[PDB]
């Protein structure tokens, strides 16, 4: 029996927090080695030292998914890909389901106090003004799903927005998350190009 469901309700509101620019400072960091073999991956995670960038990476990787590749490894630590809609959290509106009820989001979390966090991850080839419109285009495709289900359960709006030099996220992020996210999306950019072949 969770104690923390028994409390009085909070705001039912969408909190957006500011979005905020990040430079990476991974600096002259080893990178490792792949293989990729018709797709397998053998990443050679045995050349990182203990505690540098890029410690979350996983040795073997398994790739119809091509096409999402940057985008799912670069965030593979935070999350696996998923498919949670809107709707497997907070039902319909209005008794009548509708598009913004099959959007789905990179994650959406329920905590025991009744808050839901919303959070979507993002790419750019470009650099960190592409960053800033990519984070801000993802505010917009969610937000009027947000806004509407706020009304059931209050929900905070986080965006992570990755490009070669940096993170524009609202998330409150340390140097060293900065640079994992920044390390695994140049290593995913490196497959990819040979992938692509
Ligand atoms: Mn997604
Ligand atoms: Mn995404």
Same mark, same amino acid.
């Given at each position: =029996?969770?104690?923390?469901?028994?409390?009085?309700?909070?705001?039912?509101?969408?909190?957006?927090?500011?979005?905020?620019?990040?430079?990476?400072?991974? *600096?002259?960091?080893?990178?490792?080695?792949?293989?990729?073999?018709?797709?397998?991956?053998?990443?050679?995670?045995? %050349? /990182?030292?203990?505690?540098?960038?890029?410690?979350?990476?996983?040795?073997?990787?398994?790739?119809?998914?091509?096409?999402?590749?940057?985008?799912?490894?670069?965030?593979?630590? /935070?999350?696996?890909?998923?498919?949670?809609?809107?709707?497997?959290?907070?039902?319909? /509106? %209005?008794?009548?389901?509708?598009?913004?009820?099959?959007?789905?989001?990179?994650?959406?979390? %329920?905590?025991?106090? &009744?808050?839901? *966090?919303?959070?979507?991850?993002?790419?750019?080839?470009?650099?960190? !003004?592409?960053?800033?419109?990519?984070?801000?285009?993802?505010?917009?495709? *969610? =937000?009027?799903?947000?806004?509407?289900?706020?009304?059931?359960?209050?929900?905070?709006?986080?965006?992570?927005?990755?490009?070669?030099? &940096?993170?524009?996220?609202? /998330?409150?992020?340390?140097?060293?998350?900065? !640079? =994992?996210?920044?390390?695994?999306?140049?290593?995913?950019?490196?497959?990819?190009?040979?992938?692509? %072949?």
């Amino acid at each position: =029996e969770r104690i923390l469901k028994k409390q009085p309700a909070p705001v039912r509101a969408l909190t957006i927090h500011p979005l905020r620019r990040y430079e990476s400072s991974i *600096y002259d960091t080893p990178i490792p080695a792949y293989v990729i073999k018709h797709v397998t991956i053998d990443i050679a995670t045995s %050349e /990182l030292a203990d505690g540098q960038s890029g410690s979350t990476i996983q040795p073997f990787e398994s790739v119809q998914n091509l096409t999402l590749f940057k985008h799912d490894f670069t965030f593979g630590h /935070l999350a696996d890909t998923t498919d949670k809609k809107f709707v497997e959290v907070f039902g319909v /509106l %209005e008794n009548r389901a509708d598009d913004s009820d099959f959007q789905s989001p990179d994650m959406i979390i %329920e905590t025991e106090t &009744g808050h839901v *966090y919303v959070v979507e991850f993002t790419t750019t080839m470009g650099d960190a !003004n592409s960053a800033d419109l990519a984070a801000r285009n993802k505010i917009a495709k *969610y =937000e009027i799903a947000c806004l509407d289900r706020s009304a059931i359960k209050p929900i905070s709006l986080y965006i992570i927005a990755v490009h070669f030099n &940096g993170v524009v996220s609202n /998330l409150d992020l340390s140097d060293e998350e900065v !640079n =994992e996210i920044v390390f695994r999306f140049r290593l995913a950019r490196d497959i990819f190009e040979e992938l692509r %072949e």
